[PDB]
Amino acid sequence: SEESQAFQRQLTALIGYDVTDVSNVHDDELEFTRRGLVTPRMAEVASRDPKLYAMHPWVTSKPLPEYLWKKIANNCIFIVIHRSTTSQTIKVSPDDTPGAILQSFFTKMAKDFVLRVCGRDEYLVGETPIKNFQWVRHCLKNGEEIHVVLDTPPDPALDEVRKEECDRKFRVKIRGIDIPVLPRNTDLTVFVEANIQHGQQVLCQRRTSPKPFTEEVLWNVWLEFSIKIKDLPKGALLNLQIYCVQLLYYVNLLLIDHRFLLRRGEYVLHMWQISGFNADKLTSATNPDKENSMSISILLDNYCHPRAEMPNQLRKQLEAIIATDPLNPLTAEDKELLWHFRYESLKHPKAYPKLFSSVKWGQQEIVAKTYQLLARREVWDQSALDVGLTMQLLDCNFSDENVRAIAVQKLESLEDDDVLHYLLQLVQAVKFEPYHDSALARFLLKRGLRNKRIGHFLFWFLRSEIAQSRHYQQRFAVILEAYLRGCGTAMLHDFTQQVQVIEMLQKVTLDIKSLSAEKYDVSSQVISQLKQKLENLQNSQLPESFRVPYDPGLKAGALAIEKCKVMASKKKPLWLEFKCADPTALSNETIGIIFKHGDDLRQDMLILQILRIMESIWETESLDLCLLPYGCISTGDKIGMIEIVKDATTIAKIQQSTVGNTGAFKDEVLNHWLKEKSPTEEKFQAAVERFVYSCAGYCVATFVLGIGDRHNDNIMITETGNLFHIDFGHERVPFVLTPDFLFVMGTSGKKTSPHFQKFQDICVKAYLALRHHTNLLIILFSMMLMTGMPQLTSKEDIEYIRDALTVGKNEEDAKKYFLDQIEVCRDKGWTVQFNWFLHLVL
Ligand SMILES: Cc1nc(N)nc2c1cc(-c1cn[nH]c1)c(=O)n2C1CCCC1
């Protein structure tokens, strides 16, 4: 067909990769996954409610924080319904369903339709109380009034989907290695290390005789392994690595294919290089660059087609191992204890990661026994979903189909609200899967196709990696295509517009970087070029309206060249302001987006996502630490978009303003900046209240994630007291609590005050609230470093969180430690702040 071909070119433009390309492949796994993904796609597409899908209500089943009821001692929530110019308020109960609200409006004024939010593409529909809608909850947290325009429901016909159409020991021959260009260092020797890895664990290791590092190094060696072919587990990788000792290149080949067949034949594998552990080292993908990359020649001539009662102190020994942290290492003694008493271990869902890692995957008998254990699941299936525990089974330590599936089975219970909270880390967890088609990938696909909101972010998260990861672009592309093949023409159209706008704006940011590279000033010659480039695009290129990638509810239209500016950073970022495409928008505020090139925004995406997970933990204990986890999406190679937080200034800009500059910092400026920016002394005290909470929040979050020690330049504050850290792109103070912050808190030097007692109290509640979910945080942290950052210590770097979360210690010793930390920041004052300035000169 020709319309099947024209649509495939549309999918390729959306993906940023061609899924039909067979040039960097040595098997049909990517094709076989494309076919494989049709069934779960169509099933979900066939199962969806067209009314609800088109309207995507963003709802929750979580209670409603104490701290949010205090906004209603009246049991009355006010909603203002709009038509053309007419607007009328309605007295609503928190449990009032939107259905009851429509026949309370039509009743009141008597002498089919849907409630859409003013300015946004969000709707208040379905069988849920208005207290249970995320937008209403935002209006309550922000003191805002619920403006809702009464209009016709969107046509579910717009969301239409276009119809688709042997006991022999294992051995590998290392023929040789070839690189077209060698010139670098001296002439150090080179050998090939062949590892049978499964769940990051090395089952068997075999090296070659060291030979001279030339442009072609032939060995013609058969590497005999101890492992038998029947004993090889599905999901095992032949990990081929090159050492000079030091590691230069790696490549992995899956010993067993997607059709359970044993890999047999001749392979010329183009290898990835290391810079002079992480998710990239696990990839089955080969380096697409055949011209510059190192390759390995290999040959596979391997054929095939494959009660009692626990003692008191042993039960206690087992329970002590099960109680331990995820980062706690297991002894051969602990493993034998977990395994021998596996049926007792099975009774504890929290023992699962330790138990499933305790398995000897290199033994066909043991794996069958493990498969026998998972059949008696019962205690697992009945356990309350523990995402922390579930995510733990989806990391690098688990390379088994069955173990990984039981964890995915647990994620199904999640409401759309919680899926959004973990989506990024769940997509990032696909990197850990041995195979392209997996339960996790099908889970993500299913969930994305069922909710537009999840589907939007799924697109962008998949796109973020397909554009920057040579290691996983193929796999993510195959899943993106699957998603795009069932999301609907409505969404395919919005995505088309978003991609076009972002591609255009990316060009401008790069072109503007050329004009003044690292010299900081921003000449009117550059300001004119940006202004011309913007008006030149607006005229006949940029579409009339695009969906905001970091906030799909907001639709952005026309630019505002007058507010658009290039900025003073060494990397020249674009500050772009837009008119809200929506005519029913209650305000006149623009949509602000910071298009920037320079840093890897993928790390920032991950940091912001944990920040939202900490906010939700805090909600479970009725704490609101007023964080601002701003919109941030990585669009391509070291390029992306940041959300512009309205009425905000940098902490350094405020100190700078009253002159002094050269390391000079006055403790009073922040307080005067707040008083000056607040029209009434109520607005001022509310801002000090906002500062106390936001400050405590960033202090805890920051310290826990190890991104505490920051420059003034990188901490911002709103005109309304709300503090927030920015740019998490890559003496020591645990966090930023400087004398200027402490002065807003009242306190002057080594003293005490009512607002500081409050601040100290909120830190302890917040820190303890985090510690209640130690394992959750430990796993996300670990995952974030493996899938987002460069090279990382499979202990050191990761163990930071454990030490920072003060694992093992009681609630009193933990509170002391955090209050000690606060004092370190007090003692040093401006020491570190001035120290950054000093480093510019010395
Ligand atoms: C969220 C936000 N709001 C405002 N309103 N200005 C910001 C930011 C964030 C960042 C940011 C950069 N990298 N990562 C984040 C930022 O630089 N800014 C400003 C633009 C120039 C300096 C201050």
Side-chain angles (χ1 to χ4, degrees), residues 1-245 247-302 304-841:
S1 172
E2 225 300 299
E3 263 308 285
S4 72
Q5 285 188 318
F7 168 52
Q8 181 68 49
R9 272 124 62 201
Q10 193 198 126
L11 292 175
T12 305
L14 280 171
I15 299 154
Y17 193 85
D18 183 36
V19 288
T20 65
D21 178 74
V22 188
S23 53
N24 192 54
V25 124
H26 59 250
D27 64 59
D28 66 323
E29 203 199 351
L30 291 167
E31 277 308 319
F32 170 83
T33 309
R34 285 178 80 199
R35 301 134 164 76
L37 298 180
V38 177
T39 304
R41 166 161 81 257
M42 300 205 297
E44 199 57 54
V45 175
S47 284
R48 87 192 169 211
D49 184 64
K51 269 178 208 155
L52 286 172
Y53 177 74
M55 295 183 299
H56 54 275
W58 186 19
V59 118
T60 185
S61 278
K62 253 124 227 173
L64 200 196
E66 283 164 18
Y67 76 70
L68 258 197
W69 276 114
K70 61 46 174 164
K71 248 204 101 178
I72 330 118
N74 43 331
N75 200 279
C76 184
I77 284 168
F78 287 87
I79 304 161
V80 195
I81 311 181
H82 291 62
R83 237 286 141 185
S84 201
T85 57
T86 15
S87 21
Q88 177 85 89
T89 329
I90 289 99
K91 285 186 182 170
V92 186
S93 137
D95 285 72
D96 276 27
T97 202
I101 292 153
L102 291 147
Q103 278 211 71
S104 175
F105 168 87
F106 270 67
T107 325
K108 191 210 174 173
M109 59 145 276
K111 251 104 179 179
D112 201 46
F113 280 81
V114 147
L115 293 166
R116 181 181 73 86
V117 156
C118 298
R120 301 202 158 240
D121 213 273
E122 197 65 77
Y123 302 85
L124 267 64
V125 283
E127 295 302 323
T128 358
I130 37 88
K131 73 182 187 85
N132 281 8
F133 281 84
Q134 281 284 179
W135 177 259
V136 180
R137 297 216 180 192
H138 157 82
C139 296
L140 297 163
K141 198 188 138 149
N142 284 255
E144 281 172 279
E145 11 188 302
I146 313 126
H147 298 92
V148 177
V149 50
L150 198 117
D151 64 325
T152 339
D155 190 34
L158 288 154
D159 276 308
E160 193 206 74
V161 176
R162 165 159 180 87
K163 21 73 191 74
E164 293 98 276
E165 266 100 56
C166 194
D167 235 52
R168 146 82 68 107
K169 285 180 165 179
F170 169 82
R171 60 169 204 170
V172 57
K173 184 174 238 168
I174 302 285
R175 313 220 80 126
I177 64 138
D178 355 285
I179 214 289
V181 61
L182 208 128
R184 188 207 74 259
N185 283 310
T186 64
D187 40 65
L188 243 295
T189 193
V190 91
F191 69 87
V192 171
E193 188 196 72
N195 300 275
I196 307 244
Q197 285 184 0
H198 183 281
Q200 203 126 124
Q201 195 187 95
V202 182
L203 301 180
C204 229
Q205 183 172 102
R206 287 293 185 281
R207 283 131 159 245
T208 65
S209 47
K211 255 179 169 70
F213 187 40
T214 60
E215 333 260 344
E216 178 171 81
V217 201
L218 301 162
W219 268 282
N220 205 56
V221 290
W222 270 113
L223 294 179
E224 187 88 304
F225 287 86
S226 59
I227 333 294
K228 295 173 178 187
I229 297 296
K230 239 55 181 168
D231 283 334
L232 286 176
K234 200 212 191 187
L237 295 160
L238 181 62
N239 161 259
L240 304 159
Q241 291 185 150
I242 278 161
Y243 294 91
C244 65
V245 86
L247 183 70
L248 303 161
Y249 308 95
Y250 62 93
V251 76
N252 312 288
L253 183 73
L254 274 161
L255 294 158
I256 296 156
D257 89 339
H258 45 292
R259 273 161 180 109
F260 284 75
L261 308 170
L262 193 92
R263 196 134 293 191
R264 191 184 150 91
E266 297 271 8
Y267 293 93
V268 182
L269 314 162
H270 290 258
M271 307 180 93
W272 307 103
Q273 192 193 137
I274 276 134
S275 55
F277 273 82
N278 96 333
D280 289 336
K281 263 163 68 61
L282 295 203
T283 196
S284 54
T286 44
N287 201 328
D289 175 15
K290 291 193 168 76
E291 269 278 295
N292 318 347
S293 81
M294 164 73 79
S295 80
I296 191 163
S297 272
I298 63 139
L299 168 77
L300 304 170
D301 247 10
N302 298 269
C304 222
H305 212 141
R307 303 272 80 258
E309 189 83 309
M310 200 171 187
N312 180 82
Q313 229 70 56
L314 291 190
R315 179 160 273 113
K316 285 175 181 184
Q317 174 170 168
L318 194 86
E319 289 188 43
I321 300 150
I322 304 163
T324 222
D325 73 89
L327 275 159
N328 195 77
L330 300 170
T331 314
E333 212 269 280
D334 294 338
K335 285 176 179 137
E336 285 163 343
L337 214 258
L338 257 349
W339 180 254
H340 189 229
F341 295 104
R342 56 191 180 271
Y343 283 93
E344 180 68 32
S345 295
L346 206 70
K347 301 169 177 166
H348 306 270
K350 256 144 270 294
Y352 286 42
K354 317 190 156 280
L355 171 69
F356 292 110
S357 88
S358 284
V359 171
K360 278 156 167 278
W361 302 98
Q363 292 181 62
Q364 112 102 271
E365 286 201 56
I366 300 312
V367 178
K369 284 211 199 130
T370 305
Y371 285 10
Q372 269 127 67
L373 272 172
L374 287 164
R376 305 229 259 207
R377 243 179 281 102
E378 286 131 306
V379 174
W380 175 259
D381 316 279
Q382 289 155 25
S383 74
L385 171 60
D386 182 321
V387 195
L389 223 197
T390 317
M391 295 294 290
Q392 275 181 75
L393 294 164
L394 304 173
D395 75 18
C396 58
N397 309 107
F398 304 93
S399 191
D400 195 274
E401 187 184 76
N402 291 276
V403 172
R404 296 185 69 92
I406 73 139
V408 184
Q409 167 232 121
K410 234 66 223 287
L411 302 168
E412 327 250 355
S413 53
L414 292 165
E415 60 186 52
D416 289 325
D417 185 49
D418 288 303
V419 173
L420 283 153
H421 284 132
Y422 298 110
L423 179 58
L424 185 55
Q425 297 113 305
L426 284 173
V427 174
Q428 288 304 302
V430 162
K431 289 183 178 184
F432 299 129
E433 289 293 333
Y435 295 96
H436 305 315
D437 194 353
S438 62
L440 182 61
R442 285 163 175 244
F443 171 69
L444 285 169
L445 204 220
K446 278 176 186 182
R447 299 309 296 264
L449 281 192
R450 183 188 306 179
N451 192 320
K452 283 200 183 217
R453 172 157 200 89
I454 295 170
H456 170 86
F457 291 112
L458 189 59
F459 174 92
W460 287 104
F461 296 167
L462 290 186
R463 211 181 201 284
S464 138
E465 291 303 327
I466 303 149
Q468 296 180 88
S469 181
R470 287 247 100 131
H471 298 73
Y472 298 96
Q473 79 211 143
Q474 325 198 233
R475 179 180 279 189
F476 287 128
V478 163
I479 312 162
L480 227 201
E481 181 209 42
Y483 171 68
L484 292 172
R485 265 171 184 275
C487 74
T489 58
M491 296 238 265
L492 284 162
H493 152 67
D494 292 9
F495 284 136
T496 302
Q497 279 181 329
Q498 295 177 58
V499 172
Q500 277 158 334
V501 170
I502 68 92
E503 279 175 351
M504 288 184 209
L505 294 160
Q506 268 180 54
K507 279 184 262 99
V508 187
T509 321
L510 299 179
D511 300 333
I512 265 72
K513 245 194 169 215
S514 321
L515 314 143
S516 79
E518 286 186 76
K519 188 81 187 180
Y520 62 98
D521 59 301
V522 191
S523 65
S524 190
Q525 201 165 287
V526 173
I527 296 148
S528 184
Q529 281 168 302
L530 177 266
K531 280 219 175 189
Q532 270 176 50
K533 260 176 168 284
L534 281 172
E535 57 204 72
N536 285 138
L537 277 165
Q538 183 121 258
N539 270 269
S540 56
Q541 287 81 1
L542 188 98
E544 303 256 291
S545 61
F546 77 98
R547 206 160 283 272
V548 167
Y550 64 72
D551 176 19
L554 283 182
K555 191 185 276 171
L559 274 147
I561 338 285
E562 326 89 342
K563 294 154 177 191
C564 294
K565 59 202 167 78
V566 187
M567 294 172 290
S569 175
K570 288 108 268 168
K571 35 208 83 204
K572 307 290 170 172
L574 256 54
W575 179 284
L576 300 141
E577 299 209 24
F578 290 89
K579 286 166 183 97
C580 176
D582 190 284
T584 71
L586 53 109
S587 192
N588 240 34
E589 292 157 62
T590 51
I591 291 138
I593 302 155
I594 298 161
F595 255 96
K596 189 170 81 70
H597 172 96
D599 309 295
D600 192 29
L601 246 29
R602 273 178 305 172
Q603 299 160 39
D604 299 71
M605 283 200 288
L606 260 343
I607 297 298
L608 272 339
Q609 203 59 78
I610 297 180
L611 248 44
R612 307 197 188 83
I613 284 142
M614 286 184 285
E615 282 229 280
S616 62
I617 284 154
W618 293 328
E619 208 181 323
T620 80
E621 295 171 42
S622 282
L623 270 165
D624 189 307
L625 284 290
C626 308
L627 296 197
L628 279 153
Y630 59 89
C632 177
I633 297 280
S634 197
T635 45
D637 184 55
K638 303 207 196 77
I639 217 287
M641 30 153 67
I642 298 102
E643 177 201 342
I644 294 164
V645 174
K646 310 303 257 195
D647 303 308
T649 333
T650 265
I651 284 294
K653 273 182 197 164
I654 297 147
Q655 310 279 298
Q656 212 184 107
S657 72
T658 331
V659 90
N661 296 52
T662 56
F665 304 115
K666 199 186 186 166
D667 308 358
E668 220 153 319
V669 201
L670 240 195
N671 216 320
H672 298 144
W673 191 76
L674 282 176
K675 188 75 209 89
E676 177 246 312
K677 295 296 192 178
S678 34
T680 68
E681 236 270 11
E682 224 196 67
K683 282 167 170 274
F684 173 76
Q685 282 306 322
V688 186
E689 192 72 6
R690 204 132 194 88
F691 183 87
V692 173
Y693 280 102
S694 61
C695 197
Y698 283 97
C699 289
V700 182
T702 229
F703 175 71
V704 169
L705 300 173
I707 57 152
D709 192 354
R710 307 283 294 169
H711 350 38
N712 252 23
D713 171 27
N714 288 138
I715 305 121
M716 292 195 88
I717 182 163
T718 60
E719 271 179 27
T720 182
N722 207 329
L723 187 88
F724 63 106
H725 285 223
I726 52 143
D727 188 32
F728 324 89
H730 180 65
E731 240 148 61
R732 21 271 116 190
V733 70
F735 45 96
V736 185
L737 172 67
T738 45
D740 58 321
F741 282 32
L742 294 156
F743 188 88
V744 178
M745 270 166 255
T747 332
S748 315
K750 279 266 128 163
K751 213 176 93 282
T752 12
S753 77
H755 273 299
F756 178 75
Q757 255 122 88
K758 208 179 176 158
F759 163 82
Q760 273 187 306
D761 163 51
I762 314 153
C763 281
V764 161
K765 283 190 197 172
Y767 185 62
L768 289 182
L770 292 193
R771 288 180 85 263
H772 301 139
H773 303 265
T774 284
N775 295 12
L776 207 202
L777 295 180
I778 290 208
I779 226 287
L780 311 181
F781 191 74
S782 182
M783 273 175 156
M784 166 191 62
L785 310 170
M786 299 183 296
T787 73
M789 323 297 120
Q791 198 78 109
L792 56 320
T793 47
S794 276
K795 199 196 297 57
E796 279 208 44
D797 280 301
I798 330 241
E799 306 197 336
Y800 171 83
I801 203 147
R802 162 168 84 178
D803 305 330
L805 271 171
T806 194
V807 163
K809 292 274 82 62
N810 56 86
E811 299 251 295
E812 275 303 317
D813 289 356
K815 156 226 205 164
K816 191 175 185 172
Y817 183 86
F818 211 78
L819 297 161
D820 297 333
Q821 299 305 337
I822 284 176
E823 300 300 13
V824 181
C825 304
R826 288 245 288 173
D827 302 339
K828 280 124 120 78
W830 296 105
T831 295
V832 176
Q833 277 319 111
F834 158 77
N835 245 315
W836 299 113
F837 248 87
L838 216 185
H839 297 2
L840 265 279
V841 204

